[PDB]
Homo-oligomer: A and B are copies of this chain.
Amino acid sequence: TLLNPYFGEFGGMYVPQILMPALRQLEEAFVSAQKDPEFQAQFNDLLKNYAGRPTALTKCQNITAGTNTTLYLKREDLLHGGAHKTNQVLGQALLAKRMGKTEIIAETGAGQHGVASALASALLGLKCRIYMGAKDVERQSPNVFRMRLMGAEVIPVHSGSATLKDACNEALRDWSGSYETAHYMLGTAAGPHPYPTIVREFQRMIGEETKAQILEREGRLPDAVIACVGGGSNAIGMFADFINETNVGLIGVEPGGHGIETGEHGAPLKHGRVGIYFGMKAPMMQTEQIEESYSISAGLDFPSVGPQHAYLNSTGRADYVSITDDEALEAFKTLCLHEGIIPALESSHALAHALKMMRENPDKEQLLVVNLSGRGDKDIFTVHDILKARGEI
C-alpha cells in the first residue's frame, strides 16, 4: 500500500481479504493518475466544459444587512446535476476508464449519489448499476426514473432493512467479485482507504476556487469556511486548501435532527464513539452495535463521519457544530426569501450555522463563506409537507 490508510487513529481498511487487491489496485491506479497531467488535463476539461466549473461565489448582502458579517456562498448548487457530488463522480468515472474498467457499481440512499453516478457513467460511457434499498426505491420515484433515463440499472435491495446500509453492503459484495471489470464509485469521503483520500482529492477544487475568488474579491482569506458534514465529502473538498491557512476557520455542521439530545440526529462526531463501520474506523452512533441516524435531510442522514474529519476534529484544527431540523428549515426559507436561491436542505444546515454566528454577533466584523453544496429544488416537496403538517400551509 503506497499511501497511509489512516488519519490519526481513524480510517483504515477493515474489509475482507478478498477486497484488499481491489482496494490496493485502485489506490495505485489513483496515484499513477494523480501524477499524470494528461489525466488532470481530461479531468479539468470535464469539470470545466461539462459540469460548468468554476462555480460562482455569491455575496449575500440582503441576508447580512444590518450586521458586520460579510457572507459568501460557494455555489455548488450551480454545478451540473445540482450538487458537489458531480465533481468526485466525474473524477472516478475517468479513473475507472483509466483502469480499463467497463462498469460502475454504486449505491444511493435518496438517489442523489445515484443520479450523479448514472450521469458520469452516461458521459464516460460505462455500464452503471446502482444498488438501492427497496424502501428508498419506493420513496424516490423521480431519481429512480432519472437514473433509468440516464441508462443506469437500479437494483432494489430487499435484504436486511431494505435501506441504505443494505444497499451499501450488497454493493460491496458485488464489487468483491467483480472488481476486475467494475469500479466501485463510493459516494463520499469515507469507507476503506483509498476512498476518503480519492474523494478529498476529487472535491478539493471547491476549496481551491474559493480561496482564489475570495482573494480577488476581498483581498483576504475568510475568518471561517462553514460546510455541512454527512460522510464529509463537500466539507473536506472545501476544507483541504485551507487546512494550511491556520488563521482560517474550519467549521463542520452535522445534523442536529430532532435535537442532539433525543437520539434522533446524526452528529456522531461530537456525540458518538469510535468503532469500525463501512470498512473504516471512525466515530459513529452505536447502541451498545451500530444505531440509527436522522435528519429532515437525507443527504446528511449518516450515522458516522469520514476519517479525516474525525481526525481534524481531534487535533482541533477544525470545529464541528450541530444545527437542527428547524434551524435548517428556517435558513432554507431565509435564503429563499432574500437571495432568490433555494438551498438544498443539506446545505441549509451550514447556512443555518452561519446565520447563527451573525445574529448572535451583529457588530462582530466577520468574513464568512458557506459551501452551498446543492440546490434545494429536490426538497420543496419535503419542506411543503412539513410546513403543511405543522399547519402553516
The interface of chain A, by Cβ under 8 A from chain B, is: 48-52, 55-59, 62, 75, 77-80, 82, 118-123, 125, 142, 145-146, 149-151, 333, 336-342, 377, 380-381, 383-384
Contact = CB atoms under 8 A, between A and B. Distances in A.
Contacts of A59: 49
Contacts of A125: 62
Nearest to A80: B78
B342 A149 contact: yes
Contacts of A339: 122-123
A340 B52 contact: no
Contacts of A384: 145
Contact of A50 (B56, B119, B337, B383): B56
25 contacts: A49-B56, A49-B57, A50-B56, A50-B58, A51-B56, A52-B52, A52-B55, A52-B75, A62-B123, A77-B80, A82-B377, A122-B337, A122-B338, A122-B340, A123-B340, A146-B342, A146-B377, A146-B380, A149-B333, A149-B380, A149-B383, A150-B337, A150-B340, A151-B336, A377-B377
A339 B125 CA distance: 9
Task: Sort A-B residue pairs by CB-CB distance and give the 4 closest, nearest first.
Answer: A122-B340, A119-B340, A149-B336, A123-B340
Contacts of A151: 336-337
A145 B388 CA distance: 12
A52 B56 contact: yes
A333 B146 CA distance: 10
A254 to B, nearest CB: 25
Contact of A120 (B146, B340, B380): B340
A78 B58 contact: no
A141 to B, nearest CB: 8
Contacts of A119: 340-341
Contacts of A49: 56-59
Contacts of A80: 56, 75, 77-78, 341
A146 B149 CA distance: 26
Contacts of A120: 340
Nearest to A116: B340
Counting chain B CB atoms within 10 Å of each CB, the highest count among A51, A55, A75, A150 belongs to A150
A340 B337 CA distance: 32
Contacts of A380: 142, 145-146, 149
A340 B46 CA distance: 12
Contacts of A56: 48-52, 80
A58 B123 CA distance: 12
A111 to B, nearest CB: 12
A64 to B, nearest CB: 14
Contacts of A342: 146, 149-150
A75 B80 CA distance: 9
Nearest to A341: B80
Contacts of A149: 333, 336-337, 342, 380, 383
A120 B339 CA distance: 9
A370 to B, nearest CB: 15
A384 B142 CA distance: 9
